[PDB]
């Protein structure tokens, strides 16, 4: 979720994770990816 994503060093994005990050979980009721 958003809380764990952000607290653990990630960001919530709806579409693509930028280069040198990867999908690790989700945010916003699962509609977005947590990119770390």
Beta strands, E only, the chain: 11-13, 23-27, 32-35
Residues 6+ apart with CB under 8 A from 10: 21, 24, 25, 34, 35, 36
Handedness of CA 11, 17, 32, 13 (dihedral sign): positive
How was this structure obtained?
X-ray
Enclosing domain of residue 24 = 2-35
Q: What is the resolution of this structure in A?
A: 1.8
The number of distinct structural domains making up the chain is 1
Per-residue b or e along 1-24, where b marks 16 or more CB atoms closer than 10 Å to that residue's CB:
ebeebeeeebbbbeeebeeeeeee
Is there a contact between 17 and 35 (Cβ–Cβ < 8 Å)? yes
Rg (CA), the chain: 8
């Amino acid at each position: 979720d958003h809380y764990n994503c952000v607290s653990s060093g990630g960001q919530c994005l709806y579409s693509a994770c930028p280069i040198f990050t990867k999908i690790q979980g989700t945010c916003y009721r699962g509609a977005a990816k947590c990119c770390k």
